[PDB]
Amino acid sequence: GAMNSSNYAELFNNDIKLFVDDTNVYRVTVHKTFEGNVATKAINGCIFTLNPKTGHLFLKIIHTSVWAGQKRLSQLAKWKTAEEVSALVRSLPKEEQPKQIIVTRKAMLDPLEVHMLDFPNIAIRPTELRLPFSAAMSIDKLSDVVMKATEPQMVLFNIYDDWLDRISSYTAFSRLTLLLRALKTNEESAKMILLSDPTITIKSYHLWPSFTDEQWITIESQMRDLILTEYGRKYNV
């Protein structure tokens, strides 16, 4: 059934599963035309497919050309996400195919389910969590590789860098969601926090700075304080 706070640790057990988030699959800018009408221009997008246990990220880049001559693009985007997730699964050896796929938006259930008809033992589930995966394009290296692409392209990352060498999946995922949540609520501040100190660098094969254990504690506290501040501002509390 649905994923929520009660069954949260199931994400870190040894059943293979993937989160699919489609929020950055169809991306537009909105502008005015010479005649004064509004028009959209699409830009490159991405399906965010993540194994929360291992950190393996399957970044499928959605080139604008996919939309050419198509209608009801926001509807199509759900089916293109499902078509690309299913092809991903088909591409993996049997022992690596997920037992569950958790969609971060319920509108994805019917498209994926129809595309996974060939995999009846792969359970497609919704979730009640309010995961911040839309902020994935706030990670500079992910946004860069999306925006630069000239064709459909899959790019593989470990979204946890090397954290698992020292912390558990559970803790890794809580760091990831906390960082992304901060980036979502106030990108400019969040990014300031991460990079203030030029002496802490991002390895070329990594997405996030190489903080020491102590420095992650300070970071995480700074990210928490950010999120709470923005809340009082939002609601006047």
């Binding site: 199509l76 089916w79 499902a82 078509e83 019917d110 498209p111 389910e113 129809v114 595309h115 008809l117 060939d118």
Partner: protein
């Protein structure tokens, strides 16, 4: 005109014949129903005074034989049976008429209701849904489950309706995932019409039979099946013009005939708002739409 005599009526029961029904009192001298119009199927059904649960009944066609009702006190219910002795049967019938112990099938001559509800229903098709090939009539009751329900126990008692499922390999061509799921025309016309039902009349026959089983026995699987077959049509962008117009007529007399008080369990809110207002065929059910609004605006 044909007759279905009854040996006796030992227990207080409400008896139905098609859309008509009569209360019969414990050991009241009731001995059958006469003047039953030849040419369509019929259904005679029962609800004991003591057990307002399990409505049951028998689908039959008088052309296929002489049929009578007899209470079985072991099994506790009115059983339809066939008399093979033609002479012995006209004898029982004529004597009961003589003594005038029979109700007349109460058809007003202006009334095409039963024809409009059973236009495409064939006794041969019914007996393939209710497989029991040692009888020429078919038993149905409140509790009987459908083959599709059983998949998600006893097959001898199963309603073998055609399985429709929008999220199945059958319904969805590889490569046309999105297309086929948003526009079921290929499931309807190629898979179901051309493939399985062979023509629109058998399709419509199963649709009507399903509806009647829901109305008369509150059979929930039949209600599910009726809605499914409506949805399949309404969710197809490409339907023969003759099917659309006939569907409007079919549904009109179904909505017309339904007891006002049962609209809550027998009408699936999603399916109807989808068919009447969202689907491809929204504009193609004018009579059905008009009668639904004037009689059940709440559901909508």
């Amino acid at each position: 005109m044909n007759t279905v005599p009854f040996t006796s009526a030992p227990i207080e029961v409400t008896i139905g014949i098609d859309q008509y029904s009569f209360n019969v009192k414990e050991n009241q001298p009731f001995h059958g129903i006469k003047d039953i119009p030849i040419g369509h199927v019929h259904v005679i059904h029962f609800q004991h005074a003591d057990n307002s649960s399990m409505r049951y009944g028998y689908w039959f066609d008088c052309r296929m034989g002489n049929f009578y009702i007899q209470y079985d006190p072991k099994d506790g219910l009115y059983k339809m049976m066939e008399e093979r002795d033609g002479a012995k049967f006209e004898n029982i019938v004529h004597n009961f008429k003589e003594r005038q112990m029979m109700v007349s099938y109460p058809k007003i001559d202006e009334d095409d209701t039963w024809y409009n509800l059973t236009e495409f229903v064939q006794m041969d098709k019914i007996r393939k849904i209710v497989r029991k090939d040692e009888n020429q009539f078919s038993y149905v009751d409140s509790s009987m489950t459908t083959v599709q329900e059983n998949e998600l126990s006893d097959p001898a008692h199963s309603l073998n309706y055609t399985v429709i499922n929008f999220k199945s390999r059958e319904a969805i061509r590889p490569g046309h995932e999105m297309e086929d799921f948003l526009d079921k025309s290929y499931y309807l016309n190629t898979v179901m019409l051309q493939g399985i039902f062979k023509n629109s009349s058998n399709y419509f026959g199963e649709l009507q039979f399903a509806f009647l089983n829901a109305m008369f026995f509150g059979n929930y699987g039949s209600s599910l099946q009726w809605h499914a077959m409506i949805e399949l049509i309404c969710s197809s962008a490409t339907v023969p013009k003759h099917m659309l117009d006939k569907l409007d007529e079919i549904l009109y007399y179904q909505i017309k005939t339904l007891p006002e008080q049962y609209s809550d369990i027998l009408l699936n809110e999603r399916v109807w708002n989808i068919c009447l207002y969202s689907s491809f065929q929204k504009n193609s059910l004018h009579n059905t739409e008009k009668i639904m609004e004037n009689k059940y605006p709440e559901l909508l």
